[PDB]
Amino acid sequence: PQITLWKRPLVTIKIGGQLKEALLDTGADDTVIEEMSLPGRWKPKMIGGIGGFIKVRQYDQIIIEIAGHKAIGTVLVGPTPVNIIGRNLLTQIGATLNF
Amino acid sequence: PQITLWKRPLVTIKIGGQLKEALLDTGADDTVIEEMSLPGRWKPKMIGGIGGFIKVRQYDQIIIEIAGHKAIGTVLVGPTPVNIIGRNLLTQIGATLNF
Numbered sequence: 001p002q003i004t005l006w007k008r009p010l011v012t013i014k015i016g017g018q019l020k021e022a023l024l025d026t027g028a029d030d031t032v033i034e035e036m037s038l039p040g041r042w043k044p045k046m047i048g049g050i051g052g053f054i055k056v057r058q059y060d061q062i063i064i065e066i067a068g069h070k071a072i073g074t075v076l077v078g079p080t081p082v083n084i085i086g087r088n089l090l091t092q093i094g095a096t097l098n099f
Numbered sequence: 100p101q102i103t104l105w106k107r108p109l110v111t112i113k114i115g116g117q118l119k120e121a122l123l124d125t126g127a128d129d130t131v132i133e134e135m136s137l138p139g140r141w142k143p144k145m146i147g148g149i150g151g152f153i154k155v156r157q158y159d160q161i162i163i164e165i166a167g168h169k170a171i172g173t174v175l176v177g178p179t180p181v182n183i184i185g186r187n188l189l190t191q192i193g194a195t196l197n198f
């Protein structure tokens with residue numbers, strides 16, 4: 001699809017068998033999801049932005065379906081105010097900014 | 100152009116006669132720039148990010164070039180970690196997300 005930017009670019013994702021809403025964020029290096037269970041080992045990370053840093057759990061090799069398009073990569077889990085799809089998965093679904 | 104997301108989508112902007120680097124950010128409602136001097140009166144605004152909330156100065160009808168495209172609109176100034184171009188100006192330069 002072509003997504004215009006008059007409104008927040010929200011899509012449905014499927015992760016860990018769960019449907020969620022998430023923001024496509026070209027300004028995010030990483031993908032960050034609210035508290036949920038994921039399989040595998042994890043390691044802590046601190047990630048920052050406006051307002052400072054939060055602590056998250058880093059899980060690797062996680063599959064996500066993003067608006068119907070599957071991608072695999074690292075997913076960070078923690079107290080994010082918004083579920084965010086970042087560049088690590090946006091690249092995999094072939095997303096570009098065009099103007 | 101078509102901008103891929105393997106690297107941060109950094110562009111050159113011009114504001115106040117000065118060139119700066121900024122991040123094209125579909126996950127940002129608004130445009131937020133680091134401390135600088137702008138003309139006119141400002142109004143208060145609170146904004147949120149991944150780490151919490153911050154106070155910024157809101158300036159309206161500011162002339163700004165983004166990757167060579169002219170825009171005129173609202174610019175927020177404050178303690179953002181990085182200059183970000185948000186949807187308010189992405190829409191003025193005709194940007195879309197595509198996959």
Ligand SMILES: *O[C@H](C)[C@H](NC(C)=O)C(=O)N[C@H](C(=O)N[C@@H](CCCC)CN[C@@H](CCCC)C(=O)N[C@@H](CCC(N)=O)C(=O)N[C@@H](CCCNC(N)=[NH2+])C(N)=O)[C@@H](C)CC
Pocket residue numbers: 023025027028029030031032047048049050080081082084086122124126127128129130131145146147148149179180181183185
């Ligand atoms: O971690 C890497 C190194 C990098 N960090 C830094 C410090 O550069 C990074 O990728 N950080 C990510 C990040 O926070 N990216 C932001 C831009 C770069 C740092 C400033 C953009 N992220 C979005 C995420 C949505 C909120 C969680 C963001 O902050 N959007 C704001 C921008 C401010 C503004 N007014 O536009 C935003 O849109 N805020 C509005 C509210 C959003 C809340 N929505 C709902 N429904 N409640 C607003 N009007 O205030 C992070 C994510 C780590 C990978």
